[PDB]
């Protein structure tokens, strides 16, 4: 996969992104 | 809780790291097996050639 | 363990993950400060 | 703020890692097929010698 075409991989990356962006926006409050 | 927050973040990253390793390990598993079976064929051929020449000698 | 090429035994892979983590940890300390 | 940019950076890294790994597996597979083909040759001869 050249841009990453694997749905399992992208799912793992998106979840991490989602979880981290939430923790950070819970640390600034 | 800047220290409690950092621990949570790191546990989460530690998860992700083990998870991405499993993902890559499984992605290339068939190549790792191909190498193993063919490397087995080379052993078998090497256990026939070395037996004939020795016998031949 | 059957192969020395395998990702689980690959120090390049570990380096890349370790670096992501190191960066994220440094980055997030900056965002809080 | 967000970490999107870090992850986008990590995705390119992971793609370069995978390509690299594909190469490493490819060469090793070809190297062993060659060293495999040339074993059937020596066997093909040592059998045809005795005919
Ligand atoms: Cl890339
Ligand atoms: Cl890069
Ligand atoms: Na948002
Ligand atoms: Na660690
Ligand atoms: Na990184
Ligand atoms: Na961009």
Author numbering:
A (entry chain A): 123 to 151
B (entry chain B): 155 to 211
C (entry chain C): 119 to 151
D (entry chain D): 161 to 211
Q: What do the authors say?
A:
Vps34, the primordial phosphatidylinositol 3-kinase (PtdIns3K) that phosphorylates the 3-OH of phosphatidylinositol to form phosphatidylinositol 3-phosphate (PtdIns3P), is conserved in all eukaryotes, and it is important both for endocytic traffic to lysosomes and vacuoles and for autophagy. The minimal Vps34 complex is a heterodimer of Vps34 with Vps15, a putative protein kinase. This Vps34-Vps15 complex is the core for 2 larger, heterotetrameric assemblies known as complexes I and II. In addition to the Vps34-Vps15 core, complex I includes an accessory pair of proteins, Vps30/Atg6 (BECN1 in mammals) and Atg14 (ATG14 in mammals).
